[PDB]
Swiss-Prot record, chains A, B:
It holds the Pfam family TIM. It comes from the Eukaryota. D-glyceraldehyde 3-phosphate binds at N9, K11, G169, L228, G230, N231. PANTHER family: TRIOSEPHOSPHATE ISOMERASE (PTHR21139:SF2). CDD domains: TIM. Homodimer. This is Triosephosphate isomerase.
Length: 246, 246
């Protein structure tokens, strides 16, 4: 029933040439975009090069958007993104929260501005290692998800991403069972706050050191609908991660 | 002699169409780029469009660059900028210091990263209303400039910008004499730390509500070498500001 979603997140990475080579390899995979969404999130200044090189089957997005007051924070606004026809934005990703102290309240506000401007939003959340050790995973996730999920209107256009912070960029990936357990709870939170039909439509991705070895067991899980992929998305074998969802 | 430098900074705005019409009006101005530097700093995702539309006599740049640490901050790196042939970078601009708590040490590091990658740097600093009311202007400026000025190597490639914070975006522009007095003291810091020849070469710009009515009286002052212009640089009349420096 629900369409899988696989996303590449190219984080502070790339040159004109490396993108050229990588896009060409991605373009060599045949998949049907009416069946599978595949989205690439390049560095801001590489967005146009990247969109120009990727075939229309690939969707594209940017990695952050501002809240939404006149005083310019130097982030890209949702209005600017719409005018450039940028289809997706990421919100709440680890680095915004870690370096820029972005809050749950900021996350909500960003989702508001994205939806107001007809952008599709990939909204990220997850617990720290300490929180997981302190047996606080569900509490954390619950608070993070309920900061924004009632704003969701069309449940094809907001994608939730569970990324435990300890898995991001570390090679330490969640087991399928660790992930599933959290996704199952996330979908229940959507059910209880937005309705059953909506909870069953919305995509909930895992991210955190997803690779060609582990992707099949993850996606097999029933409440895991695809992935946000960092390091592994910089290599040509990313195509095999996409295939895991085909 | 010392080459004048006028910069447009387009803060969180534009659309594809507004840039088309604005760049067109700019391109109608005949000036000699061997005699006058004119740099346009668009939003990141508008860099490509803007650069394609502006004639070669305009230089271009980005509004921020990251420090050199394995966990990506989402900012564009100096390396990426060089690979894109982005000529200039702004460092230390007010929003970074205010919204993201960017420090003088951060500014030093960004300058180090920029020069390591052959980027030319437009380095901004300035006091608050409170600091100025508390007679601390010269002390504040001095700490800010001494944070990085020693790293300067080629004194054509780093440009200093005095923007008192109370003048930025407010309409409340510094008088010629307010700015001149600071500019003299900046240039002396440079003479004392870097050498007299170097101090006479470096450009020191004023920014903070420069407009078509005030720009002539500012540029006339001996130690003001140009401008960084926000709100006024979104209008077709910005050409008249460039003309005050021709």
């Amino acid at each position: 029933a629900r369409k899988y979603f696989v996303a590449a997140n190219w984080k502070c990475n790339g040159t004109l040439e490396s993108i050229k080579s990588l896009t060409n390899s991605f373009n060599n995979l045949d998949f049907d975009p009416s069946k599978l969404d595949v989205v690439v999130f390049p560095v801001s200044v590489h967005y146009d090069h990247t969109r120009k090189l990727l075939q229309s089957k690939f969707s594209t997005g940017i990695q952050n958007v501002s809240k939404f007051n006149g005083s310019c924070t130097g982030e890209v606004s949702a209005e600017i993104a719409k005018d450039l026809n940028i289809e997706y934005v990421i919100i709440g990703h680890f680095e915004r929260r870690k370096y820029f102290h972005e809050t749950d309240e900021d996350v909500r506000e960003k989702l508001q501005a994205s939806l107001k401007n007809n952008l599709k939003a990939v909204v990220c959340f997850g617990e720290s290692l300490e929180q997981r050790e302190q047996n606080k995973t569900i509490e954390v996730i619950t608070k993070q998800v309920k900061a924004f999920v009632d704003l969701i209107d069309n449940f094809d256009n907001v994608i939730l991403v569970y990324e435990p912070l300890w898995a991001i960029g570390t090679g330490k990936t969640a087991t399928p069972e660790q992930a599933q357990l959290v996704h199952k709870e996330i979908r229940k939170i959507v059910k209880d706050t937005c309705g059953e039909k909506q909870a069953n439509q919305i995509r909930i991705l895992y991210g955190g050191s997803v690779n060609t070895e582990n992707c099949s067991s993850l996606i097999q899980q029933e409440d895991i609908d695809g992935f946000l992929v960092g390091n592994a998305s910089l290599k040509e074998s990313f195509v095999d991660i996409i295939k895991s969802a085909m």
